[PDB]
Design a binder for this molecule. Structure first.
Ligand SMILES: CCCCCCCC/C=C/CCCCCCCC(=O)O[C@@H](COC(=O)CCCCCCCCCCCCCCC)COP(=O)([O-])OCC[N+](C)(C)C
Ligand SMILES: CCCCCCCC/C=C/CCCCCCCC(=O)O[C@@H](COC(=O)CCCCCCCCCCCCCCC)COP(=O)([O-])OCC[N+](C)(C)C
Ligand SMILES: *[C@@H]1O[C@H](CO)[C@@H](O[C@@H]2O[C@H](CO)[C@@H](O)[C@H](O)[C@H]2NC(C)=O)[C@H](O)[C@H]1NC(C)=O
Ligand SMILES: CC(C)CCC[C@@H](C)[C@H]1CC[C@H]2[C@@H]3CC=C4C[C@@H](O)CC[C@]4(C)[C@H]3CC[C@]12C
Ligand SMILES: CC(C)CCC[C@@H](C)[C@H]1CC[C@H]2[C@@H]3CC=C4C[C@@H](O)CC[C@]4(C)[C@H]3CC[C@]12C
Ligand SMILES: O=S1(=O)NCN(C2CC2)c2ccc(F)cc21
Lengths: 48, 48
């Protein structure tokens, strides 16, 4: 763990980064469906 | 003395050091035994 070490840090960095962009695409498909029905909770809850 | 019938030399007598074999699970040695767990908890984690 002293030798390689940092690849687990960037594995912990990219996956936390990936959960961030996963919500941002979820809120984006709540946004293009926002011109259909409601502001968020229509396309949020149906896709939740 | 007569003329020699065998040639000599002072030298050092000592034990051979034991050549302990690289036993058949030798390929696990290049990583520490916690890193093999940390890779296993990565591929059980990142897959989840
Ligand atoms: C690279 C990419 C990642 C791959 C995924 C791996 C992730 C999962 C892995 C998880 C853990 C894998 C093993 C790590 C820990 C054991 C090794 C160890 O510590 O050495 C021990 C020895 O070893 C032994 O003598 C017996 C212990 C080894 C059992 C065999 C493990 C099966 C490997 C199959 C793995 C799964 C295969 C299928 C995978 C889908 C320490 O003993 P020692 O005192 O230091 O030395 C003895 C001295 N002597 C030899 C002279 C006698
Ligand atoms: C989400 C996050 C996770 C959540 C947390 C969950 C909790 C997890 C927390 C875990 C905490 C860590 C505890 C274990 C520490 C072991 C290290 C050690 O020193 O012991 C030994 C490990 O040597 C082995 O014997 C390993 C066991 C065999 C390897 C095969 C396992 C994987 C199989 C394939 C995997 C398939 C993959 C499939 C993928 C789809 C090494 O020393 P030794 O000299 O060899 O000792 C001999 C011991 N003996 C006599 C009994 C043999
Ligand atoms: C080869 O020689 C002996 C034979 O086992 C080993 O020396 C032993 O070392 C342990 C501790 O390291 C002690 O019990 C004694 O000093 C020795 N044991 C006996 C029974 O005399 C030595 O370790 C072996 N291996 C080498 C040199 O690599
Ligand atoms: C960076 C984040 C927060 C915002 C941007 C998200 C990106 C990755 C998303 C938003 C809009 C998405 C596109 C929307 C529609 C289509 C058409 C389809 O036939 C192929 C995929 C494609 C082309 C998508 C690719 C991924 C995309 C470009
Ligand atoms: C994605 C997950 C499941 C991977 C496995 C768990 C990770 C996050 C954990 C398990 C053990 C942890 C390491 C344990 C010890 C040290 C030494 C310290 O001086 C710096 C942090 C560091 C290097 C840790 C980094 C994070 C680490 C590698
Ligand atoms: O020709 S000698 O005088 N008598 C014979 N021997 C040898 C047994 C090898 C040796 C060995 C080493 C020498 F230098 C001389 C001799």
């Amino acid at each position: 763990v002293q030798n390689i070490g940092g690849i687990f840090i960037v594995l912990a960095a990219g996956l936390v980064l990936s959960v961030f962009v996963a919500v941002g695409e979820f809120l984006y498909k709540s946004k293009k469906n926002a011109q259909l029905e409601k502001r968020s909770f229509c396309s949020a809850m149906v896709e939740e | 003395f007569s003329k020699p019938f065998m040639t000599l030399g002072i030298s050092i007598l000592y034990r051979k050091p034991n050549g302990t074999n690289p036993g058949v699970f030798s390929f696990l040695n290049p990583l520490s035994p916690d890193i093999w767990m940390y890779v296993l908890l990565a591929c059980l984690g990142v897959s989840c």
